[model samples]
Target: KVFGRCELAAAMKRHGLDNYRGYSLGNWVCAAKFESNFNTQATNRNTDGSTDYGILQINSRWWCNDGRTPGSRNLCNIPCSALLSSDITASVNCAKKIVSDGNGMNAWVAWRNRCKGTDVQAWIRGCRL
Candidate 1:
């Protein structure tokens, strides 16, 4: 959960780019990856793409502030370093918001799920959480 600094830097390049919010890049990726593998194009096939999207993997897309695609700039679009410049812990709050949505990522769960198949329960039980 610490993200250290080295790993966080890589995360920023892969997912943050112009979103150079220092620690937030790593933080966001931590939560976002757990939710959707840092995939900006991620969509829940079961939900008809209505669930989560972009780096933040924010659901109810209209409410989020991330790029709809790789590069979009609107309210629901990815804001430049919005999370980092503001909170410096964008990922934590992001994950918190996701979890508040009834069921979502938790820190310990996310880490345990990092091994394979995108999730832990999916790895051990052969079913999605």
Candidate 2:
């Protein structure tokens, strides 16, 4: 069905993504679908030529691991490679950590919150650690 490609389910399991209806994928899809659609690897270019891309929905300047002139190719023009490590723990953890760090889910939390729906209990049940 996926054209010999890995199932997002298997990949999600391998990365311990819980369910596409829950955490990272859920949140990512919500944010992306509402904000930009579930394009795991999309880049946004501004009128000024600036760009924001990838899972963390990171901006190009500091999105790359090095925070160098050119960040990550998985990102924008950066050649540093992606920091999210595909769909593994890195992607989810990185986003969660950032949310915890910033004390806000502004963009990254969109999917989690949406998947969670109206009730906290439903969310808890769905994500059930």
Candidate 3:
């Protein structure tokens, strides 16, 4: 599913990403925009042979197991396919674990390069939250 900006924001908030781990909902929404353009089925293969999966692009090498990424830690303890679901609950939970594990939102390069140190409020500008 490709979510509209406000739709993604509301979904993220409903799943507890609002102000999660000191990052505002806007931050997450902004990151998602750049990471996968709010597409639940988005996937990218990295040069290191691991793949990124789902809306937030959780990594196969460290977060989810895809049976292809070498040395996958599977820290999220889930199959990579789970991240591609339209429900997004599993993706959100895995992202929370990534932050709780001390990586912070910087765990995603898109977040670091695009959303970090920027005013992300515009990402949710007209959303009646």
Candidate 4:
């Protein structure tokens, strides 16, 4: 399912991403805007042969195992497919794990380039969080 911006914000906040690891909910919302436009089934294949999956675009190279990424660490211990569902629980959890691993929100290049060091409050504006 493709989530509306505020809907995504509320859902993510419910999963404890409001200010997770010092990254604001707006940052997460902005990341999703560029990463996949809030589409849960989004996928991207990297030149290195690893694939990114879901709204947050978690990579198969080190996070989720797609069984095709060579030498995948599978640090999240989940199938890449798990992230493609509309539920988003697996995706959110994996994102948290990525942050917990000391990568911060910079794990996503989209966030680093688009959402970082910018005023992201607009991403969550009008959302009654």
Candidate 5:
């Protein structure tokens, strides 16, 4: 929670998110900002009745299961609670897997709705990495 953009970018780059698995760091940044403002504990229910979890807003219907929620496919095989941790490794790993499957950040609605084809330089602007 409350991580700086540069720090997040650094960590993401360190984790190979800059341009790995067919997605860019900008895609992740835009998704994170739009999805949860980088809040790891962020959780919200969608209009269609599925809940999104954590920084990348991984959907409970597909990627995670909260147990309180029903009909979760839990495709990512990660516990819903694990995604809310201060450590973002689980979330990053899941996202990379999704992208590698050719989803290309399309798994996140925020990326499609906001980041695609936009100038995403600002996401990594001023970062030493």
Candidate 6:
């Protein structure tokens, strides 16, 4: 589903993602914007042949199983389909698990290229977080 930036931010905040796991809330929202344009059902086939799932673009190679992709580490232990729901609770939890890993938002290439060291507040500009 399409989401306004503030709306999405509010949902994420409700998930307790503000300043979550050492990353700023703006960075999280910014990463989601670039990763999937906030589309909960978003999925993409990466160039490496793994599929990206959900708003955070969690990958099939490590995080979830799309059934077609073979041998996922499945660290989040969730089906890829579960991340596609608009409810976002599962997605937020899984994303938190991902951030709990060492690299933080650096786990996302979009965060590195688009959000890292940038003015992330622009992502939440005019939004009440």
RMSD of each: 11.6, 7.0, 0.8, 0.7, 1.5, 1.1
Provide the lDDT at 51 for model 6. 93
Tens digit of per-residue lDDT, candidate 3, span 57-123:
9998899999998777999999999999989999999999998877799898999998999999989
In the range 1-129, model 1's lDDT, one tens digit per residue, is 333334444544444432333223333344445655544444442243334434444444333443333332234333433433323344434544444454333322444365323432222232121
- Winner on TM-score between 5 and 6 is 6
Show the lowest summed lDDT stretch of 10 residues, model 3. Answer: 99-108
Error of 6 at 8 (Å): 0.5
Stretches of candidate 5 exceeding 4 Å from the true structure: none
TM-score of 1: 0.31
Q: Once superposed on the true structure, which residue ranges of model 2 sit more than 4 Å away at CA?
A: 1-25, 47-49, 65-90, 109-129
Evaluation by TM-score, superior candidate among 2 and 3: 3
Question: What is the TM-score of candidate 3?
Answer: 0.96
The predicted structure with the larger TM-score, 3 or 6, is 3
Cand. 1 Cα-lDDT: 0.40
Ranking by TM-score: 4, 3, 6, 5, 2, 1
Would you list the C-alpha lDDT of every candidate in the order shown?
0.40, 0.42, 0.93, 0.93, 0.81, 0.88
Candidate 2 global CA lDDT score: 0.42
Candidate 4 worst ten-residue window by lDDT: 99-108
Each candidate structure's TM-score, on Cα atoms with residue i matched to residue i, is 0.31, 0.44, 0.96, 0.97, 0.90, 0.94
**Which of 2 and 4 is ahead in TM-score?**
4
Candidate 5 per-residue lDDT over residues 2-119, each given as its tens digit: 6778888877788779878656787778778888898899999887678888888887777887785677688788888888998899898888777776667777888888988898
Clash pairs (backbone) in predicted model 6: none
Clashing pairs in 3: none
